[PDB]
Design a protein around this ligand. Structure first.
Ligand SMILES: C[S@@+](CC[C@H](N)C(=O)[O-])C[C@H]1O[C@@H](n2cnc3c(N)ncnc32)[C@H](O)[C@@H]1O
Ligand SMILES: C[S@@+](CC[C@H](N)C(=O)[O-])C[C@H]1O[C@@H](n2cnc3c(N)ncnc32)[C@H](O)[C@@H]1O
Ligand SMILES: CC(C)CC(=O)C(=O)O
Ligand SMILES: CC(C)CC(=O)C(=O)O
Ligand SMILES: [Cl-]
Ligand SMILES: [Cl-]
Ligand SMILES: [Zn+2]
Ligand SMILES: [Zn+2]
Lengths: 336, 336
């Protein structure tokens, strides 16, 4: 009893927040794969009869899942068959994003490291990340750690035209056009699924005449930069590093074309990951990001000094670097 | 700058310890699968030339991994080719155990929940947990949250004979015999790999005459309880629930045979998971443990009241329940 009480207090201190985070991440990744997490919100209820039909799940199984997440404190049962997310659900979901990204999205690298160390080329084509999991976990991490800064910076500039390179479902552009009256936008993406999803979301928002979705590569902007002309802001979120070190010349031409294409006073806003930071807050997650990129994906992450030298080499007059809450994430504002 | 500073502070608060834990868990699961984590300790160095040869890894690849974990703050480079774990490595490894257990060991349940909801029997035989990952993550969780209480309780009783049901590599029995002079022990396990590993560890400790390793089932103790006779302490860590609800009668006979077999003043010490607790500290991880057991594995977790009624039904005169730091974990001491 006395020995057990001391071990209890010691063990609680040692475990800290890891049981809570471990549980949240597993429930939310499972729920997201089922399509349930998208219907969970702190300001409205999920009706199980309707959601089970929408997701093609047996309602008794959905109810048992929701009762387990209710017991966990992640949702509140309002009436029979209705559940609301807990008040701080979005922060819990944000935190879970880091765990999902390292442990789920990058799982092929965790499990097959011996293969990548022996024959990288064979391992890289065999052990491939599920890009739906990469995207969702990135979005959850971004919600509170990089997306708000990029959003507010673009809105505060009061732009007439915004171009997003690697726009995906054009969520950022739709929200910028909603806040800046009279603004136009171009959402460039090389995936058919993403451009079709962006098209339906643009139509739903009622801004098809203002927001144009184009299915093409960022690399095609080096030879064909017409879509960038007159842009007040050009945004590129965690995309440029995928062109380095193999497509460096094409990357530099895309950057020089961005500078020359901007309207006076315009800027190119790049969010990207800098390698292996030493400061206490950032170093652990910085090393995970840097190692997965360098060792497993062979994509070159640039320091702030490298990014500034590359951006000034593309003709930009001044470059500002801003620290994001996302560890190792930096926002570079390259002024024409 | 002002907007970015506010988003920085907000984002740091929202992310909290999740980037650090996410990074630690991924590096340590990757390192454990490579066999590197076993050579990491805060009180000694890992020599890369020797460890790379022992693990059959290219030394340059091992060095790059260790330099990434050094950048992360998990290890310290002492000289060239020598690395020591950070001072608090064992607490970090403990916390990582929860993430590994929910996100790695139980990954089949996360990824294939729709299958378990549609055809449980087909899913249960198709989507199977890697039991090496279940064991290692359980051990990391146990290090600071259940193993010390069980260890100290057995040692304080000053037993002449201890039996461990589901002993594995007999780590607990070896440590109890080391602290209690003249004590004997029986390590029962139904796996050949575990019994062979236990045999080599028992021989290494120099206690082959005192510790006997037996390859047989816990269920065989219901018909053949001879090995339990005269035991002062019988230990069963997270094993009894695997016999419920299908082998209930056999479980009850194993428990009644434990009571009748104990020497006077002896006790049966069971550590197990109780279902779906509501208290704030335990509820989230309790729900994850309870849901993986109930929904995915169909194993019956018993409340404290159920465990007490079952143990008193087996003839035990008094039962005490002790809260462990492991959320939802309870230690039941059933006195003869
Ligand atoms: C914003 S990027 C962020 C993740 C990044 N691709 C990575 O893993 O390093 C993801 C989105 O950009 C798109 N995308 C990726 N590479 C692209 C490229 N070179 N040109 C155009 N779109 C691209 C993808 O289709 C997806 O919608
Ligand atoms: C201590 S149990 C804890 C985990 C538990 N099996 C679970 O997943 O619910 C794991 C160890 O007990 C052994 N074991 C499991 N079931 C057993 C049984 N019925 N009889 C004997 N040993 C058993 C395994 O071989 C392993 O070494
Ligand atoms: C750094 C993350 C936001 C996304 C990323 O770059 C990746 O997962 O490859
Ligand atoms: C509760 C854990 C310690 C182990 C367990 O019961 C399992 O993983 O099945
Ligand atoms: Cl000019
Ligand atoms: Cl009696
Ligand atoms: Zn990337
Ligand atoms: Zn279990």
């Amino acid at each position: 009893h006395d020995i057990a009480a001391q071990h209890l207090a010691d063990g609680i201190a040692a475990s800290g927040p890891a049981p809570d985070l471990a549980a949240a991440a597993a429930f939310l990744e499972m729920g997201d794969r089922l399509g349930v997490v998208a219907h969970l919100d702190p300001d409205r209820t999920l009706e199980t009869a309707e959601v089970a039909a929408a997701l093609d799940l047996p309602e008794p199984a959905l109810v048992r899942y929701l009762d387990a997440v209710e017991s966990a404190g992640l949702v509140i049962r309002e009436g029979e068959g209705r559940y609301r997310a807990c008040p701080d659900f979005d922060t819990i979901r944000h935190q879970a994003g880091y765990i999902s990204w390292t442990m789920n999205a990058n799982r092929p690298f965790i499990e097959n490291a011996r293969d990548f160390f022996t024959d990288w080329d064979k391992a890289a084509r065999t052990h491939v990340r599920d890009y739906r999991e990469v995207a969702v976990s990135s979005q959850w991490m971004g919600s509170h750690a990089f997306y708000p800064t990029a959003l507010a910076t673009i809105i505060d500039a009061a732009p007439r035209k915004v171009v997003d390179l690697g726009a995906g479902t054009c969520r950022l552009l739709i929200e910028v056009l909603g806040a800046v009256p009279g603004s136009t936008g171009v959402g460039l993406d090389f995936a058919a699924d993403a451009c079709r999803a962006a098209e339906q979301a643009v139509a739903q928002a009622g801004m098809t005449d203002r927001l144009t979705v184009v299915e093409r590569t960022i690399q095609s902007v080096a030879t064909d930069p017409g879509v960038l002309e007159g842009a007040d802001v050009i945004h590129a979120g965690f995309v440029f590093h995928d062109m380095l070190p193999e497509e460096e010349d094409v990357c530099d031409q895309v950057l020089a074309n961005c500078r020359e294409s901007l309207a006076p006073g315009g800027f190119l806003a790049i969010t990207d990951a800098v390698p292996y930071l030493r400061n206490d807050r950032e170093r652990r997650f910085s090393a995970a990001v840097s190692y997965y990129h360098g060792e497993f994906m062979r994509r070159r992450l640039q320091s702030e000094e490298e990014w500034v030298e590359r951006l000034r080499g593309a003709g930009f007059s001044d470059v500002r670097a801003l620290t994001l809450a996302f560890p190792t994430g930096r926002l570079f504002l390259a002024h024409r």
